[PDB]
Design a protein around this ligand. Structure first.
Ligand SMILES: *N1=[C]C2=C([C]=[C]1)[C]=C(O[C])C(C1=[C][N]C3=C1[C]=C(C1=[C]C(C(=O)N([C])[C]C#[C])=[C]N=[C]1)[C]=N3)=[C]2
Length: 269
């Protein structure tokens, strides 16, 4: 903990990131290293202090090439900082929508899915869940490096279930049926969300279930409606989506199985 602690005056704030989408996140400069960093701050009513401080504590334990790396914290005295590495190309959703598809082609998409599934395999092993897997929550660096934002991770042992607080509102079109109906989350609900993320990647950032009313999504899902295969999407990639969208959570593949399948497809391309 104290090994991560640093003075606030080691950081200079340059630009506010967002805009507002992720809260109070700023582009910053770690002066002694001339290093651009991302700085999370706590305002008046952004989030509760103890939650903010727990986010910093959890990230200290997280180390993976495809998870946003913690660099330091300022947790001795307010204003509290959380300092992480900076991903120059922003979120994956806007990246896919605005990219050159001749550069970001089929093999690059597989490479992206491989990286993300690698991070989720890690979280799966370390008994963590993400609970908001989506393109908007993945970050892109140079050479199609993709990292998953890990600022809302929850501790949960394999086979256990997290029950979301009462009155919680979910990103419905990314949300597993057991979560929509009973506020229950597990690594298998992350698997479901990963399937939607795959669909986002295959469509270069199109909105899921296009035109479909949010109020009828759950009802469609229980009658085994699923999104059709996007064009250009390899059948085996789509079969991985459909596997992620099995009704029964235990029927869904593990992230270890998902990552292995993508690693094979990526290497054999
Ligand atoms: N606490 C810390 C966070 C977040 C929530 C709570 C969310 C984040 O983004 C998902 C970060 C974060 C860490 N590294 C990082 C982060 C966000 C960006 C980013 C940059 C840009 C961008 O390039 N703009 C606006 C133009 C310029 C300059 C767009 N979106 C996201 C990059 N790296 C930390």
């Amino acid at each position: 903990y104290d090994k991560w602690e640093m003075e606030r005056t080691d950081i200079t704030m340059k630009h506010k990131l967002g805009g507002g989408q992720y809260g109070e996140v700023y582009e910053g400069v770690w002066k002694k290293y001339s290093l651009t960093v991302a700085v999370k701050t706590l305002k008046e009513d952004t989030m509760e202090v103890e939650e903010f401080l727990k986010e910093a504590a959890v990230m200290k334990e997280i180390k993976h090439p495809n998870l946003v790396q913690l660099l330091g914290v300022c947790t001795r005295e307010p204003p509290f900082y959380i300092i992480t590495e900076f991903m120059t190309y922003g979120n994956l959703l806007d990246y896919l929508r605005e990219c050159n598809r001749q550069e970001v082609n089929a093999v690059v998409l597989l490479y992206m899915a491989t990286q993300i599934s690698s991070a989720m395999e890690y979280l799966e092993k370390k008994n963590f869940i993400h609970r908001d897997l989506a393109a908007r929550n993945c970050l892109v660096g140079e050479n199609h490096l993709v990292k998953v934002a890990d600022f809302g991770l929850s501790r949960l042992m394999t086979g256990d279930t997290y029950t979301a607080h009462a009155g919680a509102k979910f990103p419905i079109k990314w949300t597993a049926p057991e979560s929509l109906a009973y506020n229950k989350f597990s690594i298998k609900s992350d698997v479901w969300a990963f399937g939607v993320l795959l669909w986002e990647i295959a469509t270069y950032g199109m909105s899921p279930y296009p035109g479909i009313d949010l109020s009828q999504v759950y009802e469609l899902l229980e009658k085994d409606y699923r999104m059709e295969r996007p064009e250009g999407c390899p059948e085996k990639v789509y079969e991985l989506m459909r596997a992620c969208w099995q009704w029964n959570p235990s029927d869904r593949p593990s992230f270890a199985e998902i990552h292995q399948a993508f690693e094979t497809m990526f290497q054999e391309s």
